[PDB]
Amino acid sequence: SQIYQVSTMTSLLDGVYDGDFELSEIPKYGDFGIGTFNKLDGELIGFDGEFYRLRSDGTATPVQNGDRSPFCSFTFFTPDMTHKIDAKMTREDFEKEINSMLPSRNLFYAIRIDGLFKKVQTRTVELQEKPYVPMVEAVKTQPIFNFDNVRGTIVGFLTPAYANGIAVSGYHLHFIDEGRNSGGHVFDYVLEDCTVTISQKMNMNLRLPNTADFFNANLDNPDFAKDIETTEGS
Amino acid sequence: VSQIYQVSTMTSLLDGVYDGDFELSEIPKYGDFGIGTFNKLDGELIGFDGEFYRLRSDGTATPVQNGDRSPFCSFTFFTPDMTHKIDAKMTREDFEKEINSMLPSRNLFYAIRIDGLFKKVQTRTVELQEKPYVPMVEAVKTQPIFNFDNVRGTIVGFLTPAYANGIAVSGYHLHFIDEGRNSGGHVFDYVLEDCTVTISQKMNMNLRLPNTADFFNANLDNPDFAKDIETTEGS
Numbered sequence A: 001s002q003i004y005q006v007s008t009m010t011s012l013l014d015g016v017y018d019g020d021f022e023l024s025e026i027p028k029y030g031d032f033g034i035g036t037f038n039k040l041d042g043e044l045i046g047f048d049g050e051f052y053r054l055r056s057d058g059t060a061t062p063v064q065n066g067d068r069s070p071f072c073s074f075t076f077f078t079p080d081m082t083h084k085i086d087a088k089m090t091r092e093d094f095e096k097e098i099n100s101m102l103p104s105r106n107l108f109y110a111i112r113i114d115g116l117f118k119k120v121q122t123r124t125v126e127l128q129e130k131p132y133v134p135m136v137e138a139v140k141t142q143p144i145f146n147f148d149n150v151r152g153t154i155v156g157f158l159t160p161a162y163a164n165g166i167a168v169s170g171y172h173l174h175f176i177d178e179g180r181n182s183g184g185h186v187f188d189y190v191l192e193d194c195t196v197t198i199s200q201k202m203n204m205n206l207r208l209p210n211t212a213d214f215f216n217a218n219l220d221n222p223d224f225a226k227d228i229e230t231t232e233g234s
Numbered sequence B: 001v002s003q004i005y006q007v008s009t010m011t012s013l014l015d016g017v018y019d020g021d022f023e024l025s026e027i028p029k030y031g032d033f034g035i036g037t038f039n040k041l042d043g044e045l046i047g048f049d050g051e052f053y054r055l056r057s058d059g060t061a062t063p064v065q066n067g068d069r070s071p072f073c074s075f076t077f078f079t080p081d082m083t084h085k086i087d088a089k090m091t092r093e094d095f096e097k098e099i100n101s102m103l104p105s106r107n108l109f110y111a112i113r114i115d116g117l118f119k120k121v122q123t124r125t126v127e128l129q130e131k132p133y134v135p136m137v138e139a140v141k142t143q144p145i146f147n148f149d150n151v152r153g154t155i156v157g158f159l160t161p162a163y164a165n166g167i168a169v170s171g172y173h174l175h176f177i178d179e180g181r182n183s184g185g186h187v188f189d190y191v192l193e194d195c196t197v198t199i200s201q202k203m204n205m206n207l208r209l210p211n212t213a214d215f216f217n218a219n220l221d222n223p224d225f226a227k228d229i230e231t232t233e234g235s
């Protein structure tokens, strides 16, 4: 089984926010995934075949037909491992407990947390206007949301270090509430109680966009790893 | 048809994981063109037009067979998307900068083939290792190095974007085999006398991870991997 990877994180860093991947094709490649949309117009999250665009106006809109993306990741989720979080557990505690239970730090995993969270902190990237700026600049004015005692789902991927720059090394997680209105890209969280489900994948298929923007992008940033830490963290 | 099929990672090779589970009987499922190595680092892999060889330090080149295994290799179905002629004497540096300027993008994957006569080719052939394995930086210190003069044959390999360094080898990664199919190896340097160039552009890379305990348990978090790849791959 595979992670289907649409373009690279370093292209997003360089301000290439317009891709040619059409979300009408999501069912060909997975029923689970995360990412963003063209122009950075919102956060993508989906699982069980149901995908949403989360925007900074506090809405979550089902994805449709000609929605496009410069960057996203999909898989067909299979429940290979399950784990229960009984009581309060912080992100640092959780992420450390899970990665100690992985068969290998050298494989790809999809991960889903379903339950109640004491806290979740998210961002939602917002629509950008041309000419685009690099992502480190673009996220400085992102909306940040703090949720308390909220029911919902955190979903995303664990990525081995050797793929950092194609994807985001380590945990990359998005959140949507049970009411399907709010969430975004996750910075931090505390679990009250949840069920964990993990899917192990032995392949990553990277698909590069057929766009002039991607062809002409400058992807030779020696500081990309620190720039990813900056854009993806609080 | 539009992918590089990538078997495991260069950083796993760096860590001394020389035994994979990829069986070369399955090469025809994934390409007719490629390079890499074999289990135990027993020789260099090269193939094109569906014909693959194991190049060893003893100056032989043996056709690959059924149960040959590899920890690291790259394949594609080669399509002649671009052609170019090198009319006269041209150094590696000349050539690599001439081709690189002609690529549609430095952000895509390419297969590349040079067929003709080379004034010089310098190669290495990694040699069979005995367990317990040492890291690749140590393993290559005693590699056989060959120098060929005015030789006819084929240089073949891949151009890899910088974002995939560590999965594969960023930039040019090229192997060589002579027309007599006996000699060659992993290319360190070369001077073209005259050759035909053919290039194939790919929009996908599919990375396949081995189902081996060795790979599962490997330490792939070497902050210095890029320099270590420089070391093992130049002269």
Ligand SMILES: [Zn+2]
Residues within 6 Å of the ligand: A034, A035, A172, A173, A174, A185, A186
């Ligand atoms: Zn994200």
Ligand SMILES: [Zn+2]
Residues within 6 Å of the ligand: B035, B036, B173, B174, B175, B186, B187
């Ligand atoms: Zn090589």
